Amino acid sequence: ATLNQMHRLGPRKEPPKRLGPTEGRPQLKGVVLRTFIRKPKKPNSANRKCCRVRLSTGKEAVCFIPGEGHTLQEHHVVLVEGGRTQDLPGVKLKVVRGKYDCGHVQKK
Amino acid sequence: KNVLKIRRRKMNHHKYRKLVKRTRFLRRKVREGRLKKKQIKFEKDLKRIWLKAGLKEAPENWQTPKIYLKNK
Amino acid sequence: IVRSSVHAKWVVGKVIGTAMIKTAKVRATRLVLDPYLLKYFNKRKTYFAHDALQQCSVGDIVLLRALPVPRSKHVKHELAEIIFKVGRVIDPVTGKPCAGTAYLESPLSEPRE
Amino acid sequence: EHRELMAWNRDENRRMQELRIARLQLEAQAQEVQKAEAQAQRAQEEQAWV
Amino acid sequence: QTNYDVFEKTCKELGVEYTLPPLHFQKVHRRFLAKKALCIRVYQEVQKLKKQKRALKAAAAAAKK
Amino acid sequence: PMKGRFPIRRTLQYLGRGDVVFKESVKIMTVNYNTYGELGEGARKFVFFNIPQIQYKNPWVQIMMFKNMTPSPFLRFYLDSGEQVLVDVETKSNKEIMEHIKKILGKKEETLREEELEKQQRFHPGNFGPRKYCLRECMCEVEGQVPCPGLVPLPKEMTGKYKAALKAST
RNA sequence: AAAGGUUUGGUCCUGGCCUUAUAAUUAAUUAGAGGUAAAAUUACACAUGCAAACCUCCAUAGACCGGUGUAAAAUCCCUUAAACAUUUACUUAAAAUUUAAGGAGAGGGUAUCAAGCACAUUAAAAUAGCUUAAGACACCUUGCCUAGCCACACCCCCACGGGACUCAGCAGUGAUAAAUAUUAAGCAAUAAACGAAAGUUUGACUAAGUUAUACCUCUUAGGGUUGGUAAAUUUCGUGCCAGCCACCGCGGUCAUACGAU
RNA sequence: ACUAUGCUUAGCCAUAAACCUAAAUAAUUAAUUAACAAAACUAUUUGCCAGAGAACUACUAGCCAUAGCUUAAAACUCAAAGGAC
Ligand code: FES
Ligand SMILES: [K+]
Ligand SMILES: [K+]
Ligand SMILES: [K+]
Ligand SMILES: [K+]
Ligand SMILES: [K+]
Ligand SMILES: [K+]
Ligand SMILES: [K+]
Ligand SMILES: [K+]
Ligand SMILES: [Mg+2]
Ligand SMILES: [Mg+2]
Ligand SMILES: [Mg+2]
Ligand SMILES: [Mg+2]
Ligand SMILES: [Mg+2]
Ligand SMILES: [Mg+2]
Ligand SMILES: [Mg+2]
Numbered sequence: 001a002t003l004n005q006m007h008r009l010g011p012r013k014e015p016p017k018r019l020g021p022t023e024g025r026p027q028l029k030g031v032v033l034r035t036f037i038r039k040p041k042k043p044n045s046a047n048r049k050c051c052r053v054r055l056s057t058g059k060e061a062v063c064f065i066p067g068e069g070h071t072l073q074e075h076h077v078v079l080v081e082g083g084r085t086q087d088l089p090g091v092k093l094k095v096v097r098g099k100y101d102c103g104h105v106q107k108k
Numbered sequence: 109k110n111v112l113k114i115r116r117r118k119m120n121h122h123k124y125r126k127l128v129k130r131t132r133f134l135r136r137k138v139r140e141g142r143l144k145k146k147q148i149k150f151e152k153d154l155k156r157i158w159l160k161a162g163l164k165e166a167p168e169n170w171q172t173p174k175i176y177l178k179n180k
Numbered sequence: 181i182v183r184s185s186v187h188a189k190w191v192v193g194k195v196i197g198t199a200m201i202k203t204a205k206v207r208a209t210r211l212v213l214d215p216y217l218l219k220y221f222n223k224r225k226t227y228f229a230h231d232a233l234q235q236c237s238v239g240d241i242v243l244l245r246a247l248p249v250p251r252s253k254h255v256k257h258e259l260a261e262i263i264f265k266v267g268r269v270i271d272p273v274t275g276k277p278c279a280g281t282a283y284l285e286s287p288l289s290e291p292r293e
Numbered sequence: 294e295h296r297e298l299m300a301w302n303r304d305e306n307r308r309m310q311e312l313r314i315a316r317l318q319l320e321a322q323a324q325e326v327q328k329a330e331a332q333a334q335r336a337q338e339e340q341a342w343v
Numbered sequence: 344q345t346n347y348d349v350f351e352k353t354c355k356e357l358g359v360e361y362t363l364p365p366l367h368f369q370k371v372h373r374r375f376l377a378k379k380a381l382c383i384r385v386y387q388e389v390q391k392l393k394k395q396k397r398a399l400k401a402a403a404a405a406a407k408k
Numbered sequence: 409p410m411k412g413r414f415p416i417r418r419t420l421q422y423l424g425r426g427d428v429v430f431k432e433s434v435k436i437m438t439v440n441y442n443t444y445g446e447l448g449e450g451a452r453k454f455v456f457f458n459i460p461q462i463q464y465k466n467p468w469v470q471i472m473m474f475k476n477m478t479p480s481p482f483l484r485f486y487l488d489s490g491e492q493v494l495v496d497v498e499t500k501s502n503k504e505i506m507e508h509i510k511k512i513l514g515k516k517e518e519t520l521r522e523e524e525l526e527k528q529q530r531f532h533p534g535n536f537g538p539r540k541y542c543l544r545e546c547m548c549e550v551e552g553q554v555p556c557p558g559l560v561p562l563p564k565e566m567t568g569k570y571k572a573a574l575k576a577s578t
Numbered sequence: 579a580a581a582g583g584u585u586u587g588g589u590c591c592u593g594g595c596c597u598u599a600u601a602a603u604u605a606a607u608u609a610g611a612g613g614u615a616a617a618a619u620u621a622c623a624c625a626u627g628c629a630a631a632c633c634u635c636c637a638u639a640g641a642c643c644g645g646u647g648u649a650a651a652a653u654c655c656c657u658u659a660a661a662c663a664u665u666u667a668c669u670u671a672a673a674a675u676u677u678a679a680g681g682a683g684a685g686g687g688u689a690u691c692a693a694g695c696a697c698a699u700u701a702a703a704a705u706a707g708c709u710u711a712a713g714a715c716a717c718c719u720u721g722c723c724u725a726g727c728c729a730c731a732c733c734c735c736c737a738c739g740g741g742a743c744u745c746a747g748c749a750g751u752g753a754u755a756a757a758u759a760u761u762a763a764g765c766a767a768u769a770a771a772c773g774a775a776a777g778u779u780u781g782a783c784u785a786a787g788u789u790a791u792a793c794c795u796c797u798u799a800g801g802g803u804u805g806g807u808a809a810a811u812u813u814c815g816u817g818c819c820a821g822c823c824a825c826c827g828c829g830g831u832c833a834u835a836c837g838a839u
Numbered sequence: 840a841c842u843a844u845g846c847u848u849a850g851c852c853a854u855a856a857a858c859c860u861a862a863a864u865a866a867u868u869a870a871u872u873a874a875c876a877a878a879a880c881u882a883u884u885u886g887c888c889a890g891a892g893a894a895c896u897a898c899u900a901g902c903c904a905u906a907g908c909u910u911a912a913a914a915c916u917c918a919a920a921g922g923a924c
């Protein structure tokens with residue numbers, strides 16, 4: 001672009017930073033609604049443990065539960081955090097182990 | 109130089125043309141109603157002007173033109 | 181004989197319109213530095229000026245004097261002088277009529293007409 | 294000091310005006326000579342053309 | 344812009360009318376031309392009413408005097 | 409590569425090299441120059457190289473330039489009194505034009521220095537306050553004075569916590 | 579940026595994503611003591627206590643301090659005039675602090691907001707103008723100019739009036755939130771108010787209490803990681819399962835990538 | 840085999856790989872090989888571009904256009920897509 005064209009337009013317009021599943025917040029608190037299994041998109045093979053939750057904002061999201069074995073059930077309370085599960089498409093939230101009803105993984 | 113990008117657009121346009129053909133009658137009714145709302149919005153915007161100016165009736169000998177109807 | 185408050189006590193501009201009675205619309209331009217590019221560009225402003233004699237024509241360079249009291253909402257200047265008349269320029273250096281970069285009357289001659 | 298500098302300016306403008314008339318005078322003499330010669334060619338060509 | 348005197352003679356002799364370039368381009372379409380016609384008409388009606396009111400107001404004052 | 413010709417003209421150092429600071433009387437400087445010709449070469453160079461420097465040092469002066477309106481280039485200054493100073497710059501180098509206008513309508517070096525000193529009259533080295541305005545925020549910074557309790561803990565007897573305990577003990 | 583990883587069977591080009599640095603808030607795990615700074619979900623509803631007096635009556639003060647970020651593209655910088663709900667001087671002038679009318683220049687987003695619709699001038703009252711792609715108008719978002727400034731003060735922009743009738747003063751509570759300081763002491767210092775004055779008053783403030791949020795001095799040791807980018811794995815268990823990854827990716831029997839050691 | 844149609848006369852429609860896939864203009868040919876194509880490169884002015892797909896799409900406005908054209912997004916998905924050899 002010419003110097004006249006750079007002057008008439010100025011600095012590049014910056015698209016706004018749209019928020020993610022946590023809505024620009026470190027964590028959210030949600031109530032478990034259902035516990036189910038999700039299948040990782042190929043080339044991976046597993047039965048990943050997930051749960052649906054109703055977040056404090058009022059929306060409902062799918063959250064991956066990390067660790068080997070959880071005791072979560074419906075009506076439990078959990079603290080979710082950000083971070084996508086790479087193989088699980090659409091799962092953009094995770095549960096925090098050791099907060100509210102969710103507990104630390106039982107060591108073997 | 110392959111034509112792969114042209115083939116993606118080729119399929120999108122083909123499928124879109126068949127979608128319009130299926131729902132041609134529905135799309136016609138959407139348009140006639142979108143134009144009617146477009147006309148009411150035009151009339152209301154003209155009524156706002158003379159009422160704000162303080163007139164209680166539209167200017168003498170004025171009839172809002174119907175500009176979106178099948179006049180041509 | 182206090183002077184005007186406005187910063188533009190003296191402004192030069194081009195008469196871009198003359199359709200108001202006894203008033204000439206004048207476009208002045210100033211140089212403003214682009215901070216990113218550090219280059220000067222033209223910022224233009226519009227000034228309404230009182231043309232008492234309606235002696236202004238579109239395209240002529242004029243000098244405006246700030247009025248002591250604003251005549252109206254926008255008329256805060258008067259026509260001090262017509263620096264250059266449109267198509268009727270008179271060379272300041274020699275004093276002879278010119279039509280562009282040329283002399284309509286040679287400076288060697290002394291017509292005194 | 295302003296008045297002295299504004300007087301010096303007018304002197305410089307007159308000094309340069311004098312040079313301008315001297316330069317333009319020389320041009321008139323030379324251009325006049327060329328004009329006469331060019332008119333002669335037109336007279337020769339114009340007579341031949343007729 | 345260069346020789347106004349010749350310009351005036353040329354236009355008068357050749358019979359050519361010269362219109363100056365308009366500062367701003369005006370877009371035109373049925374919706375704009377229809378709204379712009381009402382806006383001009385509404386203004387005229389408002390001004391006509393004011394003129395009538397002034398005449399009646401002045402007439403009443405004159406009678407009192 | 410910086411765009412344009414002579415990209416050095418678009419640097420703060422170049423703009424600050426201008427030496428013509430007009431007197432307060434000067435309000436407008438119209439520049440009439442021709443884009444084609446031989447006797448106007450210095451004028452064209454003056455608009456190219458010098459007009460930016462003049463505007464940088466005289467932000468409140470209106471510089472308006474007109475092209476190919478007259479046979480010869482000239483400069484006309486408009487003063488606040490109403491006087492008009494016409495300068496003829498034909499056959500003159502751009503440097504010569506700058507020197508001419510500096511002499512007739514330029515502030516002297518003595519005047520400019522005096523204004524600089526007056527501007528800084530209210531800054532005092534002894535004054536304490538924020539870094540933007542002062543050298544030192546607190547007297548704790550000075551050598552020999554009691555240091556800041558955050559950096560160096562104060563003696564116990566100089567602390568309100570300790571003094572309050574004694575007053576209760578008394 | 580001194581860069582790095584990642585398209586391919588391969589190379590080069592182009593190009594996005596991510597990594598390495600820095601800081602704040604919250605959460606997991608974990609922690610001794612001392613000094614310092616800062617304290618912060620919520621313009622949501624508020625239990626109780628306090629936050630403005632002084633003084634020979636008149637007056638003055640309660641218009642400040644303190645709080646919040648409501649509203650608004652709201653402003654910055656500059657010019658002019660005028661007072662001042664003032665101070666200190668004179669019978670006439672130096673300040674502090676404001677208000678009103680303005681404008682050299684600068685000043686968030688969307689142009690799929692492109693026209694606005696009276697937004698102009700003259701001064702017989704006529705003329706038909708004014709703004710705008712050099713971004714008007716419309717809408718949306720946001721405190722900024724930071725020794726500080728601006729707006730707000732239960733709500734209805736305002737507050738005659740009306741209403742759903744007051745902690746966005748200190749401490750404290752309910753609810754809500756990922757978000758968690760004392761229902762504390764003193765007017766000794768400074769500041770403000772009052773008084774001619776000795777003085778009185780003040781949840782301003784001072785000195786404390788609380789809290790790894792930060793810094794500082796000490797003492798203890800915990801936390802994470804160990805395929806590549808990127809510093810660092812022994813053995814076993816598991817066997818596309820259970821699990822893991824910021825990116826590339828790992829796991830179907832010798833897994834330096836999972837779990838335990 | 841035979842229509843619409845290609846033809847004429849009026850009007851509409853305004854789209855092409857409408858592609859020399861080369862904006863225009865004035866210089867230079869050396870103090871210059873990413874690859875391929877069409878040797879390199881400077882200056883001036885305007886237009887345009889900012890990962891891929893979603894998308895010659897949705898909505899908006901204008902239009903003799905009504906299964907139309909021009910104008911033209913986002914959510915969401917992916918870690919590539921793409922060019923040359
Ligand atoms: S900053 Fe000076 S005593 Fe702390
Ligand atoms: K795998
Ligand atoms: K890269
Ligand atoms: K309010
Ligand atoms: K005190
Ligand atoms: K093994
Ligand atoms: K491991
Ligand atoms: K390990
Ligand atoms: K072609
Ligand atoms: Mg497709
Ligand atoms: Mg915490
Ligand atoms: Mg305050
Ligand atoms: Mg707000
Ligand atoms: Mg749209
Ligand atoms: Mg209120
Ligand atoms: Mg409240």
Ligand SMILES: [Mg+2]
Pocket residue numbers: none
């Ligand atoms: Mg209150």
Ligand SMILES: [Mg+2]
Pocket residue numbers: 745
């Ligand atoms: Mg409170």
Ligand SMILES: [Mg+2]
Pocket residue numbers: 757
């Ligand atoms: Mg906190």
Ligand SMILES: [Mg+2]
Pocket residue numbers: none
């Ligand atoms: Mg006192």
Ligand SMILES: [Mg+2]
Pocket residue numbers: 822
């Ligand atoms: Mg792990």
Ligand SMILES: [Mg+2]
Pocket residue numbers: none
């Ligand atoms: Mg790893």
Ligand SMILES: [Mg+2]
Pocket residue numbers: none
């Ligand atoms: Mg046929």
Ligand SMILES: [Mg+2]
Pocket residue numbers: none
């Ligand atoms: Mg096209």
Ligand SMILES: [Mg+2]
Pocket residue numbers: none
């Ligand atoms: Mg062709």
Ligand SMILES: [Mg+2]
Pocket residue numbers: 895
């Ligand atoms: Mg198409």
Ligand SMILES: [Mg+2]
Pocket residue numbers: none
């Ligand atoms: Mg379409």
Ligand SMILES: [Mg+2]
Pocket residue numbers: none
């Ligand atoms: Mg559409």
